[PDB]
Amino acid sequence: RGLELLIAQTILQGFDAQYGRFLEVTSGAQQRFEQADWHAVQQAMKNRIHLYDHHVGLVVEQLRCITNGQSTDAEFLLRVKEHYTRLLPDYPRFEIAESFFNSVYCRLFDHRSLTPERLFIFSSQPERRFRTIPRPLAKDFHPDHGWESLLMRVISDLPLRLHWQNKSRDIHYIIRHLTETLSKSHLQVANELFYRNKAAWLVGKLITPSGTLPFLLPIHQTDDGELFIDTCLTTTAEASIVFGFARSYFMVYAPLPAALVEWLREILPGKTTAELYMAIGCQKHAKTESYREYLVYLQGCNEQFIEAPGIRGMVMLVFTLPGFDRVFKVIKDKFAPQKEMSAAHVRACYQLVKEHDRVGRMADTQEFENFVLEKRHISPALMELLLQEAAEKITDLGEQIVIRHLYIERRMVPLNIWLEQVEGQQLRDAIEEYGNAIRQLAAANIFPGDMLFKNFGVTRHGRVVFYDYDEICYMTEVNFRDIPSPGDVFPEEFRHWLCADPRIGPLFEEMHADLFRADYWRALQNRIREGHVEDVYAYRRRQRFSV
Amino acid sequence: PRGLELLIAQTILQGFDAQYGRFLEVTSGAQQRFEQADWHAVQQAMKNRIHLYDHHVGLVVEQLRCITNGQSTDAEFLLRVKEHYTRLLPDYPRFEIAESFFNSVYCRLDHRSLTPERLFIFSSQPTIPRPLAKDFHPDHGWESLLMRVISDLPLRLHWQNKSRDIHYIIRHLTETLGPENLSKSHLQVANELFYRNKAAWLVGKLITPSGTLPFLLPIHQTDDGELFIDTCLTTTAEASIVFGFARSYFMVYAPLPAALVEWLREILPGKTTAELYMAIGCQKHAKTESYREYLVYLQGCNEQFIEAPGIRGMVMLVFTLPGFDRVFKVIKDKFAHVRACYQLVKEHDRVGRMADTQEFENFVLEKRHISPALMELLLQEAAEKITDLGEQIVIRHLYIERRMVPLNIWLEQVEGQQLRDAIEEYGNAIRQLAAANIFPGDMLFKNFGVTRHGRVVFYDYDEICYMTEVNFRDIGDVFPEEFRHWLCADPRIGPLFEEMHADLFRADYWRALQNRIREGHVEDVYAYRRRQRFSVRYG
Ligand SMILES: Nc1ncnc2c1ncn2[C@@H]1O[C@H](COP(=O)(O)OP(=O)(O)O)[C@@H](O)[C@H]1O
């Protein structure tokens, strides 16, 4: 009885589908760049985020249409795992074929049925070598006439059909970066072209005799006509930023990413197997993966989960492990009578950033409906607030305690902690990146709401990234004047909380003489509604060719 | 509205891209298996890929009928369900084949009450987004611009003396175009390559403002991994035969057939859309538009349906028209092994020596275009399941093929080189099949026909078998000497046959050419007049 193969054939055409439109979507971004539609560029991720669930939220449904006889026991919930697996030996996109299965089970079963043979949480039996690259995935450009002519190839064999602005002036520029340290090093520009936002990214590795290093060649336009490749990145420091966790991922038309995640593995050395599925847009395998990498850490170190650094939230419950890169954000119950019927506003702000353009000042997350936590890895201190600030939200499960719809984002260093830790030349850029963080947030349609110091984070290189997502609304959702009543915003009212430190508030003037002032916030909301939103540069406004 | 209206219409459009996307998973897996030279698989990837559609329609059908519990498929729900189907097709690039895949499902659920209200079986019921091709300009020589185009090709095997080719491609162009006229004549080349059999073609268009003309450069290697181009192909008439109908399916990776079909158009302005779709394997948007071409054609024509000329088949009852270029092949009943035999060629690498077919179980004709000369021949000899309905009939399990002219007949409207020309090909029609693991059980002039550009093909798989179920014993069981009785029967035609195709008669080509299959070999079919290869007669 093909009862549990009709299924496995069904949940695996869900994927084959989910990925079906994935790459048509991804493959509209070349034209949509010639074409002038950036309403379209900002709304396409928003279609990419949806397909995966758009395709499980049918196989999930059409499953139940005949899932009545022996509908469930794990007896046969397992022949689905076998039947499904046995069907993926030259399935090169198998890692994500498996990954589609997971979120389904977990949807039919409250993200909650048993582990490890009750799901694909690890890759099965390929597994390890990703040399799943039948085609080259990039071409090998070697210097014969070198660096005035060969790099002419790149710009000429681009499928991009538009009068360039000065290729020949770009050629003179590019060598200026190259001479920092040539021609005994080949070139390997990649295919296809990496797209995000108002930009196009020419990706490549400049292999040099000393060593091999990244080589990024981003393409731009004079909005809305004439285009100029701009700025020449080749640095590990730069590769990591562009590809950062505070900026939205990529439109790379990749029907094999597990291999592509292998090519860039040497463009972005520090990056994780799950940071590399994020970028290409396969964020739903980052999640199986992050967790895959996560559950290695604590199942291999010392000691337990603690409460995160900084200030305790009015809403969220935040924990982490002192060695680990990531934070877990659990929501409180408020009290016993208060009933979690849902919409949630909070889950809406966390989602309504799941699709938004973050631009470097906002960081992404993961969602699990029921996460099983080690009762033995739990401090007894973390537990006490955890137990009774989220009681309705969890359940003791014998040796384990179960928690529902938890959020995970890159651990950071709370700003207000660090603001204290620094002063001097350092203290300069901790305010600048702050206001800049609040200038760019605004332009993205993001007005921070509670804009206090500790709701943002920082990086090793030193940068601010917001992470407080209830007091968030669209810029067209607030009205701006404090002259002398719900939701309205008073821009100078902000002069109280933020200039409070008489070491840092003075220095606010030095860089942000107008964020205090109301006029300037109609400016940004108002210029968002003319159809215009300035997109982001993946570098310092100081590197640009323009200055 | 908590029903199947939405559940259902998107339950279909899912099997659809669940289907096509894996179509390209293999369609692009071909370079790596040609590259590897794993050509056995090249023949199973032309089985696999042929399978995909059929499985996804079969799957939804299981899903489809299951979702709406119990028996009934309703008609005004079949409209309800359709109205939804289009409103999701608008941002669809491959929406052309989304309407097709709709149809195969209605037919799966015995095609009763077949259309126009209830499905969209035509060209389209009602700006290129990306890279399609690329340009190359004779600015710095053509000797330099035949190494350029090439260093943007996928292949990872190392070309051995690519030096000759660049200089060897010039001439086909030079003696035909004129060294003055190839100063400013440039190239348009498709970003991906057409992979068939042992081949990895390069399909581009040559641009000479002395017209707009095709350009075709097959990539061949043998044994260890040598690479070179097996002739150059430029004039219009070559292209038919490389994209031709006796052929096996083509293997080019495009996620957007409409551009790819449409791009290739001007190369040979040769006929239609169903031919130019199927040349990629998208035969199931061919099995549709060939219903359009079926419908349009007879709209302003005063013809009728008649039997196709030739010597009435033992094999199979056939009808057709005066100016129609395709033949209808209702299988005789009470002479199924044809169901299965007729698609062992479909399944097979057709060699150009075999015709494509398309199968309709329940198929409709206006009996007015039917003349009762042919009525009772259909009404009686194909009557097992005849359904007559006042002014219309529906035929069951009927195949089709382009209607070439029959050979026996071709031979009298022939003499001169014409006979030396036409006979040569026939024996080479029998030779190809063996090498292709194919045996003609009745291999008579009766059952072979002639192509536009004078080729003979084998459209009688009715007594077919792989040559690996047969013995050709010297003196199932076959007597290659006695074929001359029926073969060498005319004192105008035969003798020409002892001149060239004398081996066909001796069991030693027969037997000893089999040992060459069940040893592993794959036969070098070619898609050119052989004389055309660069080494032969050129160098
Ligand atoms: N990504 C993070 N990096 C560092 N600390 C965090 C992070 N997320 C949450 N925290 C800690 O948990 C607290 C919860 O912050 P937030 O997300 O603003 O919820 P609330 O608005 O309830 O404070 C923060 O003040 C912070 O100190």
Ligand SMILES: Nc1ncnc2c1ncn2[C@@H]1O[C@H](COP(=O)(O)O)[C@@H](O)[C@H]1O
């Ligand atoms: N009995 C039929 N009547 C009309 N059209 C058909 C029939 N069978 C197949 N087709 C067409 O050919 C395509 C291939 O479907 P199928 O070969 O039946 O999977 C379908 O999408 C239809 O457009």
Ligand SMILES: [Mg+2]
């Ligand atoms: Mg806070």
